[PDB]
Coordinates of C-alpha atoms and ligand atoms in Angstrom, one line a residue:
Chain A
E1 CA 15.8 6.9 -8.6
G2 CA 14.3 7.3 -5.1
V3 CA 14.9 11.0 -5.6
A4 CA 12.4 11.4 -8.4
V5 CA 9.7 9.8 -6.3
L6 CA 10.7 11.6 -3.0
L7 CA 10.7 14.8 -5.1
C8 CA 7.1 14.3 -6.1
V9 CA 6.2 13.6 -2.5
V10 CA 7.7 17.0 -1.5
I11 CA 5.7 18.7 -4.3
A12 CA 2.5 16.8 -3.2
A13 CA 3.3 18.2 0.3
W14 CA 3.5 21.8 -1.0
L15 CA 0.5 21.9 -3.4
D16 CA -2.6 23.6 -1.9
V17 CA -4.9 20.5 -2.1
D18 CA -7.0 18.7 0.5
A19 CA -5.7 15.8 2.5
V20 CA -7.4 13.2 0.4
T21 CA -5.8 14.5 -2.8
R22 CA -2.3 14.7 -1.2
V23 CA -2.6 11.1 -0.1
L24 CA -3.5 10.0 -3.7
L25 CA -0.7 12.0 -5.2
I26 CA 1.8 10.5 -2.7
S27 CA 0.6 6.9 -2.8
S28 CA 0.5 6.7 -6.6
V29 CA 4.2 7.5 -6.8
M30 CA 5.1 5.2 -3.9
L31 CA 3.3 2.5 -5.7
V32 CA 5.7 3.0 -8.7
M33 CA 8.6 2.6 -6.2
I34 CA 7.0 -0.5 -4.8
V35 CA 6.5 -2.1 -8.2
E36 CA 10.0 -1.2 -9.4
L37 CA 11.5 -2.9 -6.3
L38 CA 9.3 -6.0 -6.9
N39 CA 10.3 -6.0 -10.6
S40 CA 14.0 -5.7 -9.7
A41 CA 13.5 -8.6 -7.2
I42 CA 12.0 -10.7 -10.0
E43 CA 14.9 -9.8 -12.3
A44 CA 17.3 -11.0 -9.5
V45 CA 15.3 -14.2 -9.3
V46 CA 15.6 -14.7 -13.1
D47 CA 19.3 -14.1 -12.9
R48 CA 19.6 -16.5 -10.0
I49 CA 17.7 -19.2 -12.0
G50 CA 20.0 -18.6 -14.9
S51 CA 23.1 -18.9 -12.8
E52 CA 21.9 -22.1 -11.2
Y53 CA 20.3 -24.0 -14.1
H54 CA 21.4 -22.1 -17.2
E55 CA 17.8 -21.6 -18.1
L56 CA 15.8 -18.6 -19.3
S57 CA 12.6 -17.6 -17.5
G58 CA 10.4 -16.9 -20.5
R59 CA 8.6 -13.5 -20.4
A60 CA 9.2 -13.0 -16.7
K61 CA 11.3 -9.8 -17.1
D62 CA 8.9 -8.4 -19.8
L63 CA 5.9 -9.0 -17.5
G64 CA 7.6 -7.3 -14.5
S65 CA 8.5 -4.3 -16.7
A66 CA 4.9 -4.1 -17.9
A67 CA 3.8 -3.9 -14.3
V68 CA 6.1 -1.0 -13.7
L69 CA 4.8 0.8 -16.8
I70 CA 1.2 0.3 -15.7
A71 CA 2.0 1.7 -12.3
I72 CA 3.6 4.7 -14.0
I73 CA 0.7 5.2 -16.3
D74 CA -1.6 5.0 -13.2
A75 CA 0.5 7.6 -11.5
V76 CA 0.5 10.0 -14.5
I77 CA -3.3 9.6 -14.9
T78 CA -3.9 10.2 -11.1
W79 CA -1.8 13.3 -11.1
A80 CA -3.4 14.5 -14.3
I81 CA -7.0 13.9 -13.2
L82 CA -6.4 15.5 -9.7
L83 CA -4.2 18.5 -10.8
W84 CA -6.5 19.3 -13.7
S85 CA -9.6 19.2 -11.5
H86 CA -7.7 21.3 -8.9
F87 CA -6.9 23.8 -11.6
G88 CA -7.3 23.6 -15.4
Chain B
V1 CA -10.0 -7.2 -20.5
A2 CA -12.8 -6.3 -18.1
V3 CA -10.6 -3.6 -16.6
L4 CA -11.0 -1.1 -19.4
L5 CA -14.7 -1.9 -19.0
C6 CA -14.5 -0.7 -15.4
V7 CA -12.5 2.4 -16.3
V8 CA -14.8 3.7 -19.0
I9 CA -17.9 3.1 -16.7
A10 CA -16.0 5.0 -14.0
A11 CA -15.6 7.8 -16.4
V12 CA -18.8 11.3 -10.0
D13 CA -16.1 13.5 -8.5
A14 CA -12.4 13.4 -9.5
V15 CA -11.1 11.8 -6.3
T16 CA -13.8 9.0 -6.5
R17 CA -12.9 8.5 -10.1
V18 CA -9.2 8.0 -9.3
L19 CA -10.1 5.5 -6.6
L20 CA -12.3 3.4 -8.9
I21 CA -9.7 3.3 -11.6
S22 CA -6.7 2.8 -9.3
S23 CA -8.3 -0.2 -7.5
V24 CA -8.8 -2.0 -10.8
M25 CA -5.4 -1.0 -12.2
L26 CA -3.8 -2.4 -9.0
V27 CA -5.3 -5.8 -9.9
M28 CA -3.7 -5.5 -13.3
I29 CA -0.3 -4.7 -11.8
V30 CA -0.5 -7.6 -9.3
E31 CA -1.7 -10.0 -12.0
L32 CA 1.4 -9.1 -14.2
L33 CA 3.7 -9.5 -11.2
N34 CA 2.1 -12.9 -10.5
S35 CA 2.4 -13.9 -14.1
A36 CA 6.1 -13.0 -14.0
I37 CA 6.6 -15.3 -11.0
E38 CA 4.6 -18.0 -12.9
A39 CA 6.9 -17.6 -15.9
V40 CA 9.9 -18.4 -13.7
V41 CA 8.3 -21.3 -11.9
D42 CA 6.7 -22.9 -15.0
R43 CA 9.6 -22.1 -17.3
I44 CA 10.9 -24.6 -19.9
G45 CA 13.1 -27.0 -18.1
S46 CA 11.5 -26.5 -14.7
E47 CA 10.3 -30.2 -14.8
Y48 CA 13.9 -31.2 -14.2
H49 CA 14.4 -29.4 -10.9
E50 CA 12.7 -28.6 -7.5
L51 CA 9.5 -26.8 -8.2
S52 CA 8.0 -24.2 -5.9
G53 CA 4.2 -24.7 -6.0
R54 CA 4.1 -22.5 -2.9
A55 CA 5.3 -19.5 -5.0
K56 CA 2.4 -19.7 -7.4
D57 CA -0.1 -20.1 -4.5
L58 CA 1.3 -17.0 -2.8
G59 CA 1.2 -15.0 -6.0
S60 CA -2.4 -16.1 -6.7
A61 CA -3.2 -15.0 -3.1
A62 CA -1.8 -11.6 -3.9
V63 CA -4.1 -11.3 -6.9
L64 CA -7.1 -12.4 -4.7
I65 CA -6.4 -9.7 -2.1
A66 CA -6.1 -7.1 -4.8
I67 CA -9.4 -8.1 -6.3
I68 CA -11.1 -8.2 -2.9
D69 CA -9.7 -4.8 -2.1
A70 CA -11.1 -3.5 -5.4
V71 CA -14.6 -5.0 -4.5
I72 CA -14.5 -3.4 -1.0
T73 CA -13.5 -0.1 -2.6
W74 CA -16.3 -0.1 -5.2
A75 CA -18.8 -1.3 -2.7
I76 CA -18.1 1.5 -0.1
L77 CA -18.0 4.2 -2.8
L78 CA -21.1 3.1 -4.7
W79 CA -23.0 2.6 -1.4
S80 CA -22.0 6.1 -0.6
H81 CA -23.2 7.1 -4.0
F82 CA -26.7 5.6 -4.1
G83 CA -28.9 5.6 -1.0
Chain C
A1 CA -1.9 -22.7 -11.6
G2 CA -1.9 -21.3 -8.1
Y3 CA -4.5 -21.7 -5.4
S4 CA -5.3 -18.4 -3.8
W5 CA -7.0 -19.5 -0.6
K6 CA -4.4 -22.3 -0.1
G7 CA -1.8 -19.6 -0.6
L8 CA -3.3 -17.2 1.9
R9 CA -3.4 -19.9 4.6
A10 CA 0.2 -21.1 3.7
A11 CA 1.5 -17.5 4.1
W12 CA -0.2 -17.2 7.5
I13 CA 1.0 -20.6 8.8
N14 CA 4.5 -20.2 7.5
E15 CA 5.3 -16.5 7.8
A16 CA 5.4 -15.0 11.3
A17 CA 5.9 -11.6 9.7
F18 CA 2.7 -12.1 7.7
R19 CA 0.7 -12.8 10.9
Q20 CA 2.2 -9.8 12.6
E21 CA 1.4 -7.5 9.7
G22 CA -2.0 -9.2 9.2
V23 CA -3.1 -8.5 12.8
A24 CA -2.0 -4.8 12.3
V25 CA -4.1 -4.7 9.1
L26 CA -7.1 -6.2 10.9
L27 CA -6.8 -3.6 13.7
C28 CA -6.6 -0.8 11.2
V29 CA -9.6 -2.1 9.2
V30 CA -11.7 -2.4 12.3
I31 CA -10.7 1.1 13.4
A32 CA -11.4 2.5 9.9
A33 CA -14.9 1.0 10.0
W34 CA -15.4 2.6 13.5
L35 CA -14.1 6.1 12.7
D36 CA -16.5 8.9 11.7
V37 CA -15.0 9.5 8.3
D38 CA -16.5 9.9 4.7
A39 CA -16.4 7.0 2.3
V40 CA -13.3 8.3 0.4
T41 CA -11.2 8.6 3.5
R42 CA -12.4 5.1 4.7
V43 CA -11.4 3.6 1.4
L44 CA -7.9 5.1 1.6
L45 CA -7.4 3.9 5.2
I46 CA -8.3 0.4 4.3
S47 CA -6.6 0.1 0.9
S48 CA -3.3 1.4 2.2
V49 CA -3.0 -1.4 4.8
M50 CA -4.4 -4.0 2.4
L51 CA -1.5 -3.1 0.0
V52 CA 0.9 -4.3 2.7
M53 CA -0.7 -7.7 2.5
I54 CA -0.5 -7.8 -1.3
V55 CA 3.1 -6.8 -1.3
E56 CA 4.1 -9.2 1.5
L57 CA 2.5 -12.1 -0.5
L58 CA 4.4 -11.1 -3.6
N59 CA 7.6 -10.8 -1.5
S60 CA 7.0 -14.2 0.1
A61 CA 6.4 -15.7 -3.4
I62 CA 9.7 -14.3 -4.5
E63 CA 11.4 -15.7 -1.4
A64 CA 9.9 -19.2 -2.0
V65 CA 11.3 -19.3 -5.5
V66 CA 14.9 -18.6 -4.5
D67 CA 14.7 -20.8 -1.4
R68 CA 13.5 -23.7 -3.4
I69 CA 16.8 -23.8 -5.2
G70 CA 18.8 -24.4 -2.0
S71 CA 19.7 -23.2 1.5
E72 CA 23.2 -22.0 0.6
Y73 CA 23.6 -18.3 0.3
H74 CA 23.9 -16.7 -3.1
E75 CA 24.3 -12.9 -3.7
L76 CA 21.4 -12.8 -6.3
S77 CA 19.2 -14.7 -3.8
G78 CA 20.0 -12.2 -1.1
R79 CA 19.4 -9.4 -3.5
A80 CA 16.0 -10.6 -4.5
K81 CA 14.9 -10.9 -0.8
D82 CA 16.3 -7.5 0.1
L83 CA 14.5 -5.8 -2.7
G84 CA 11.2 -7.7 -1.9
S85 CA 11.5 -6.7 1.7
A86 CA 12.2 -3.1 0.8
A87 CA 8.9 -3.1 -1.1
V88 CA 7.0 -4.3 1.9
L89 CA 8.7 -1.6 4.1
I90 CA 7.7 1.1 1.6
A91 CA 4.1 -0.2 1.6
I92 CA 4.0 0.0 5.4
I93 CA 5.6 3.5 5.5
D94 CA 3.0 4.6 2.9
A95 CA 0.2 3.2 5.1
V96 CA 1.4 5.0 8.2
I97 CA 1.8 8.3 6.3
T98 CA -1.7 7.8 4.8
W99 CA -3.2 7.3 8.3
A100 CA -1.2 10.2 9.8
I101 CA -2.3 12.7 7.1
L102 CA -5.9 11.6 7.0
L103 CA -6.6 11.3 10.7
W104 CA -4.8 14.5 11.7
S105 CA -6.5 16.5 8.9
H106 CA -9.9 15.1 9.9
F107 CA -9.5 15.1 13.7
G108 CA -6.4 17.1 14.6
Ligands
78M201 C1 -7.2 -12.8 10.7 C2 -7.1 -12.2 9.3 C3 -6.3 -11.0 9.1 C4 -6.9 -9.8 8.4 C5 -6.2 -9.3 7.1 C6 -6.7 -9.8 5.8 C7 -6.4 -11.2 5.4 C8 -4.9 -11.6 5.5 C9 -4.6 -12.9 6.0 C10 -5.7 -13.9 6.2 C11 -5.3 -15.4 6.1 C12 -5.3 -16.2 7.3 C13 -5.8 -17.6 7.2 C14 -5.1 -18.7 7.9 C15 -5.5 -19.0 9.4 O1 -5.6 -18.0 10.1 O2 -5.7 -20.2 9.8 C16 -5.4 -20.5 11.2 C17 -4.0 -20.8 11.6 O3 -3.5 -19.7 12.2 C18 -4.0 -22.0 12.5 O4 -3.6 -23.2 12.0
78M202 C1 -12.8 -8.8 16.6 C2 -12.0 -10.0 16.7 C3 -12.6 -11.2 17.5 C4 -12.9 -12.5 16.8 C5 -11.7 -13.3 16.6 C6 -11.8 -14.5 15.6 C7 -10.6 -15.0 15.0 C8 -9.8 -16.1 15.7 C9 -8.4 -16.3 15.4 C10 -7.8 -15.4 14.3 C11 -6.3 -15.6 14.2 C12 -5.4 -15.1 15.3 C13 -4.1 -14.4 14.9 C14 -3.1 -14.1 15.9 C15 -1.6 -14.2 15.5 O1 -1.2 -15.1 14.8 O2 -0.7 -13.2 15.8 C16 0.6 -13.5 16.0 C17 1.6 -12.6 15.3 O3 1.3 -11.3 15.4 C18 3.0 -12.8 15.9 O4 4.0 -13.2 15.1
78M203 C1 -6.8 0.2 20.3 C2 -7.7 1.4 20.5 C3 -7.0 2.7 20.9 C4 -7.9 3.9 21.0 C5 -7.3 5.1 21.7 C6 -8.3 6.1 22.1 C7 -9.1 6.8 21.0 C8 -10.3 7.6 21.3 C9 -10.9 8.4 20.3 C10 -10.4 8.3 18.9 C11 -10.2 9.7 18.2 C12 -11.3 10.4 17.7 C13 -12.2 9.8 16.7 C14 -13.7 10.1 16.7 C15 -14.6 9.2 16.0 O1 -14.5 8.9 14.8 O2 -15.6 8.5 16.7 C16 -16.1 7.3 16.2 C17 -17.5 7.2 16.0 O3 -18.0 5.9 16.4 C18 -18.3 8.2 16.7 O4 -19.3 8.9 16.0
78M204 C1 3.4 13.5 7.4 C2 4.1 12.4 7.9 C3 3.6 11.6 9.0 C4 4.3 10.4 9.5 C5 4.0 9.9 10.9 C6 5.2 9.4 11.7 C7 5.9 8.2 11.1 C8 6.8 7.4 12.0 C9 7.3 6.2 11.6 C10 7.0 5.6 10.2 C11 7.3 4.2 9.9 C12 6.3 3.2 10.4 C13 6.8 1.8 10.6 C14 7.7 1.2 9.6 C15 8.4 -0.1 10.0 O1 9.2 -0.1 10.9 O2 8.2 -1.3 9.3 C16 8.3 -2.5 10.0 C17 8.9 -3.6 9.3 O3 8.1 -4.8 9.5 C18 9.0 -3.4 7.8 O4 9.2 -4.4 7.0
NA205 NA1 0.7 3.2 -2.9
NA206 NA1 -8.8 0.7 -3.3
ZN207 ZN1 9.7 -15.7 4.8

């Protein structure tokens, strides 16, 4: 789970790109990790609310999962744009 | 909806394009995370318990900083672009 | 709904960790403005530290929700805070890595 992201970081450290590109490649996947952690925190909050009050939290989990997906899409796009301009 | 507006009018060099798009997409991400927190706080039945207005303020603040960051990003880049 | 400016001030007043990170952000932004770097590099130096503030605000929002329930420890409450704190940590690590790579490539 943190392997897949750290693996990308290693690749981004190996690719013959300039410093700016490397930062963008690395930061985009670290953002995915950040949003995944925040989403899992929200999921824990939802579960905590359910445990305490026996109440659902509406679309809280769906909204958090959508945040992760967008972060992932942002990462794919970033990598595509950069690594296609770098060579295509 | 005005995000996809920003994206298509960003579509300049590749690196700059990534920065313009990403700054706006970060706003989307943060807004979704803020909306998730809101869905918990304002859930059905929340009126019967202790309610964290603080949580919603903090989440809205995160959106504000994301937006401000996006403005600073576009301003610096576009000022570099023209003039 | 939430009040953003009210929220910013509340985070500052109530969270010592937010003030600590906030002053670090201000220092970095001032340095970023002072440094002789191109626009792209400047944007990255600034956005990377600003992300810490964004994530800390979200983390603090998460914390406020579970704390509102009660003071007594619950495993799910601890889990939520740990995950939120890990997110902030990764944002900070990312910021330092960004600064290290960009500054060293430009000036090293
Ligand atoms: C000094 C600002 C730090 C720079 C980073 C960007 C913004 C992050 C946080 C700013 C909100 C702080 C506002 C609250 C404040 O300082 O009021 C004064 C308070 O300390 C005394 O009662
Ligand atoms: C270039 C700066 C000069 C002008 C300063 C104007 C701003 C005045 C007050 C701003 C807020 C002070 C923040 C200090 C603070 O709370 O730090 C403590 C924190 O790091 C420890 O937990
Ligand atoms: C809290 C401040 C700590 C500063 C430590 C000492 C740093 C001295 C020089 C910085 C490294 C080289 C950067 C060069 C540079 O961008 O110059 C700035 C610009 O104003 C000149 O054209
Ligand atoms: C190419 C890599 C360059 C890296 C430069 C050296 C990095 C050394 C330390 C990195 C971590 C920075 C500080 C992280 C930290 O302790 O966070 C503080 C805590 O408040 C987090 O929640
Ligand atoms: Na990032
Ligand atoms: Na940005
Ligand atoms: Zn706290």
